Homo-oligomer: A and B are copies of this chain.
């Protein structure tokens, strides 16, 4: 009988139940997976310096993301094609987010439509993750749908001019199961790695800061740059009028040998000088990871793979369980470190 009490248990259970090609697609990093290992190892190098005797009977995990209240600084990151993991895919995910009172970043290519997800999760805090397609009419349609269907921000992914080289996907000749489809667009629906070639056909490798200007003019919605790893690029994003930075290495699935996100976070927080919120994804598996990211000045963190593992175990209930595990680990890490609320999580809590 499954007894899954931490994120790692969910991954182990997912490996046991998913087809190998699908588990490999979800698990993989790029090339030799150096950054994949480092996203996790880096968190272990940051040590915690807990304060005692601070009164933690009433721990308040609540915060805000881009002015929208959330129950905890732990939000769902964009993961493509969620119906591969569970028949309810993105609808299971958004229902879990609504229950938890946190936000869902929806992949511009999901196996579910912008409208279907807003319908399933009307009261959920919802954001759209955008790629800049070679087809700018496709791209504008996605932004307009997001605006009309009550999405609260655009996360524009800037680290994927081309897909990374995930060796298992190349070996398995990965493609979507037959009955599934990217449901916001034939060849654009994703009817070697089939995904790499799909991207080579649909995603624009020419995107530049000029296209960020276009997007900033297209929508008044808050825009976050997702995939920044350098302070100079972070400063450029602020200069282009963007409203946030998601420090991300794409789950270590793009360029291998980039630093862990927790290691580059302080340089990015320093570079933006408090002008915009900074977020982190990559390697978040435990409450202490959330605490270290907030101590180093992230407003909130996003989780990618853990959500897929929850779906694989039991759809909406499995996503809810994963998010509740992270919530309760984060509560306990705050309490044991002497933090009553997120506003008193300070830089002195951590040292590398």
Contact = CB atoms under 8 A, between A and B. Distances in A.
- Most B Cβ at <10 Å: residue of A47, A52, A255, A332: A52
Given A47-B257, A47-B259, A255-B337, A52 B158 contact: yes
Interface in A52-88: 52-57
Given A55-B207, A164-B336, A255-B337, A159 B32 contact: no
Contacts of A170: 5
Contact of A336 (B171, B207, B254): B254
B159 A255 contact: no
A236 B338 CA distance: 15
Nearest to A3: B171
A217 to B, nearest CB: 16
B55 A255 contact: no
A216 interface: no
Interface string A276-300: 0000000000101000100000000
A50 B161 CA distance: 12
Given A31-B286, A288-B257, A230 B165 contact: no
A24 interface: no
A195 interface: no
Provide the main secondary structure of the chain A interface: loop
Task: Enumerate the 5 nearest inter-chain pairs by beta-carbon distance, A residue then B residue, closest first.
Answer: A57-B206, A255-B336, A52-B158, A57-B205, A55-B208
A65 to B, nearest CB: 22
Contacts of A233: 51-53
Given A56-B162, A57-B206, 17 more contacts: A5-B170, A32-B286, A44-B257, A46-B257, A48-B255, A49-B258, A50-B159, A51-B230, A52-B159, A52-B230, A53-B236, A54-B208, A55-B206, A56-B206, A164-B336, A165-B329, A255-B333
Contacts of A159: 50, 52, 336
A161 B334 CA distance: 11
Contact of A335 (B44, B54, B56, B205): B205
